[PDB]
Design a protein around this ligand. Structure first.
Ligand code: A1AVX
Ligand code: MN
Ligand code: MN
Length: 242
């Protein structure tokens, strides 16, 4: 089976999500043919030179899955678009493009974070265009770490002071551009399986969940497609009247 996750939004103030992700990497992921992380692995990223210990702890844990023989792949989210090749090397992950077409047991599947499908959020798309401009990334990454941390903290506060869903036509256009009947994405935090029509045939759009209270993954096998919700930790059973 091939596994997909997204929207973990890891951060040091949420240690329970980190613990659930480490348990996932130590168990379930080790049996996978491959693991794909479709963006928003981290709540924020200001560059690969950041000494945040959470970054090394996560890199080591992913690298152990890779060393155990499970290739791991990453598509950027809107939160963590600055993840680069230094972190790819540290973690053993392979960085992928904004859109990729995969062969999953004979089934053609498009994968992306999903924010580029949210063409009705013009203000998000304006932000995205700015922070994906190469000279703007190069300028930001040149700034001292402590300045970058101050900028990011301020920008997060400003944003906090509701993620828009995908545009249906943008979904059809992406699935027809790639001539696929299957699409897996995250970003909208609305886990679902949607049936639509693309390329003159039934088509499906599978959406991952955010890791709020529990984890979410999509498991693709040669036989089926599974959207799975599971607890972060091993909830031990323990023991009413008639
Ligand atoms: C869907 N969302 C959004 C909706 C509408 C608009 C935006 C978002 C969104 O995605 N936002 C907004 C807040 C924010 C902070 C981070 S960050 O903290 O990781 N970090 C990244 C690197 N970064 C700079 C800064 C600059 C410069 F200074 F030049 F401006 C350039 C460069 Cl190249 N990177 C500093 C901030 C990442 C993403 C987001 S929402 C609700 O927020 O989830
Ligand atoms: Mn997200
Ligand atoms: Mn997102």
């Amino acid at each position: 089976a091939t596994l997909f996750i997204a929207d973990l939004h890891l951060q040091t103030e949420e240690p329970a999500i980190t613990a659930g992700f480490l348990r996932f990497l130590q168990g379930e992921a080790r049996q996978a043919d491959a693991l794909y992380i479709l963006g928003d692995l981290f709540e924020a990223w200001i560059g690969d030179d950041d000494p945040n210990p959470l970054h090394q702890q996560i890199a080591s844990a992913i690298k152990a899955v890779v060393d155990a023989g499970v290739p791991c792949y990453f598509i950027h989210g809107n939160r963590d678009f600055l993840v680069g090749q230094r972190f790819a090397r540290q973690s053993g992950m392979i960085l992928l493009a904004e859109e990729e077409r995969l062969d999953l047991y004979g089934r053609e599947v498009l994968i992306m974070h999903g924010d580029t499908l949210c063409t009705d959020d013009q203000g998000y798309l304006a932000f995205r265009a700015k922070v994906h401009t190469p000279w703007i990334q190069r300028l930001f990454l040149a700034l001292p770490l402590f300045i970058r941390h101050r900028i990011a903290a301020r920008m997060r506060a400003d944003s906090k002071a509701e993620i828009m869903d995908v545009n249906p036509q943008a979904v059809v256009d992406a699935m027809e551009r790639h001539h696929v009947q299957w699409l897996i994405h995250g970003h909208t935090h609305r886990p679902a399986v949607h049936e639509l029509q693309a390329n003159g045939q039934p088509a499906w759009r599978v959406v991952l969940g955010a890791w709020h209270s529990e984890g979410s993954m999509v498991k693709v096998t040669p036989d089926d497609v599974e959207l799975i919700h599971f607890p972060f930790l091993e909830e031990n059973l323990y023991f009413h009247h008639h």
